[PDB]
Design a protein around this ligand. Sequence first.
Ligand SMILES: *[C@@H]1O[C@H](CO)[C@@H](O)[C@H](O)[C@H]1NC(C)=O
Length: 437
Amino acid sequence: QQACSLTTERHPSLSWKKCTAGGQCQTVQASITLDSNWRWTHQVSGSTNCYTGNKWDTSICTDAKSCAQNCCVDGADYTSTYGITTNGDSLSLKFVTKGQHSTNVGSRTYLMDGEDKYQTFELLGNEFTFDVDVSNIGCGLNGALYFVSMDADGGLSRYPGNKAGAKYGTGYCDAQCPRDIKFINGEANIEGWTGSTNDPNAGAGRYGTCCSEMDIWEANNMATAFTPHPCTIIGQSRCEGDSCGGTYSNERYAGVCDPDGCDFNSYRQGNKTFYGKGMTVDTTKKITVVTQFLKDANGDLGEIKRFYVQDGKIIPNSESTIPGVEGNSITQDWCDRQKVAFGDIDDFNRKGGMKQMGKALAGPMVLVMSIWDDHASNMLWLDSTFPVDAAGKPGAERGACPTTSGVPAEVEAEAPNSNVVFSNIRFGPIGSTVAGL
Ligand SMILES: *[C@@H]1O[C@H](CO)[C@@H](O)[C@H](O)[C@H]1NC(C)=O
């Protein structure tokens, strides 16, 4: 896609902390950008749209290549259109934002390093910490903070049809190989584009976009999970149709990425009252979330550890109480055993497991912060029983939300002003980001 400026693009400012041995930190003045899927997409000459509602203008976009060369994404009205606001070290994402002419649902944002590049993070051997307020996001919603192996320039140098780049939030990929992404590989994903059956603003195209994903935080006030997803191709790759994998079909595991990941959700792992509203990690108030990425003796990713801080108390991660699945952290052996115990296909191991994840963690990953609902599964995989059939067994119940929850139309009508606030990002070597740790 090209970039236009009918709307001046001003990345909202956000500071974060880069920490070093002993807990010294320096404040970095930075900013955020909106993902290209949410932007106004129109002809470079016109303001004639290339995409409206959930449909490409096929009288304008006649092929994937020319569509991206002749259409641009434009700047974003962060506050008024998207309900995206910052205040110092804090980023607030509102769920539904109604304007004069239209209503926006959800957002996905990236941390920037200057105007034209994403701030990359090399997680292996390091510790990523942030504060979060999930009190106002409930069943069926996800306020996510996570890492993906996107290109730092959003694909600008790899793909000549992409002139917008990281400045305009291009180049998204994740371990679900999503096919709803409008520009992939500098080409418009117009081929066989199918309007969503339930989302008036989304559709799905011929191609999907895959890459390694480390889900530090997929959460609402009822459930949270941290989940590495390895991919046999580390960085951003395009996949074709059903070979993509990542949906709930027979072809789920056919793509290069593990769409399930090896997940640690304390509720799912047998501690139903560790995390949630009124629980030990109490989602009705601000939480500090610490995630450490430990190397083994060979320098590979050996362990992923989680600690919380709330009201000054350091809370280690809940131990898993699932028989044969001992420990309060993610390791290869833990994952092997968890998959057996839950009866789940071990695609984590098949796609290279902890070691392959560590290959992505050793290199640059991009910080993603988003608020979204789930038109495919209603977020039941996060906070309810999933799949719905499987009710009475280890692994089935991931949170206390009823299986009625998460239908996008319902949550959008009943909780439009839902929001998540991410704040006080600190990143550095293990032991540098938080005192008493
Ligand atoms: C379950 O969480 C509680 C806090 O609610 C904690 O005291 C306990 O150690 C946890 N169980 C396990 C097995 O870690």
